[PDB]
Amino acid sequence: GHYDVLSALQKSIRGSDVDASLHYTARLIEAGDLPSLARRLTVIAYEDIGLANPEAQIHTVTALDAAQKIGFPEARILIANVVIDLALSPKSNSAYVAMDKALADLKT
């Protein structure tokens, strides 16, 4: 599943570290699991970038759905655009925090 590498990719993007983000992405492309990489990058776009740059989510979902159809090797070019966009995007996890607060606030 390469969950260790997926975690390193999320930390790299959260830390706005574009060279490390591309390195961990390269390791996942060589391993060949496009579905798990597309799923994690979609979650990162909404969790870590979120409301700071809504257009990053449009470009991420569009590229990753197209990538899963095109398949490797050409899919690596679509993924490269996504990873650079997310690593160098303004970022806010406030949507994630607000959602979990609303769930915690429900009467039990």
> Which tokens go with 94?
């406030």
Of residues 1 and 104, the one with the C-beta less far from Cl ion: 1
- The answer for residues whose C-beta is within 8 angstroms of residue 61's C-beta and 6 or more apart is 42, 45
Counting beta carbons within 10 angstroms of the beta carbon of residue 49, is it exposed (0 to 12), middle (13 to 18) or buried (19 or more)?
buried
DSSP state of 51: G
Q: In the stretch 6-35, what mask flags binding to Cl ion with x, by CB under 5 A? A: x-----------------------------
Out of 6, 13, 37, 63, point to the residue binding a second copy (CB under 8 A).
63
Our finding on whether 40 is near Cl ion (CB under 5 A) is yes
Our finding on whether 16 is near a second copy (CB under 8 A) is no
Our finding on whether 3 is near a second copy (CB under 8 A) is no
Whether 52 and 89 have beta carbons less than 8 Å apart is answered as yes
Binding site for a second copy (CB under 8 A): 18-19, 22-23, 25-27, 29-30, 39, 42-43, 46-47, 50-51, 54-55, 57-59, 61-63, 65-66, 70, 74, 76-81, 84-85, 94-96, 98-103, 105-106
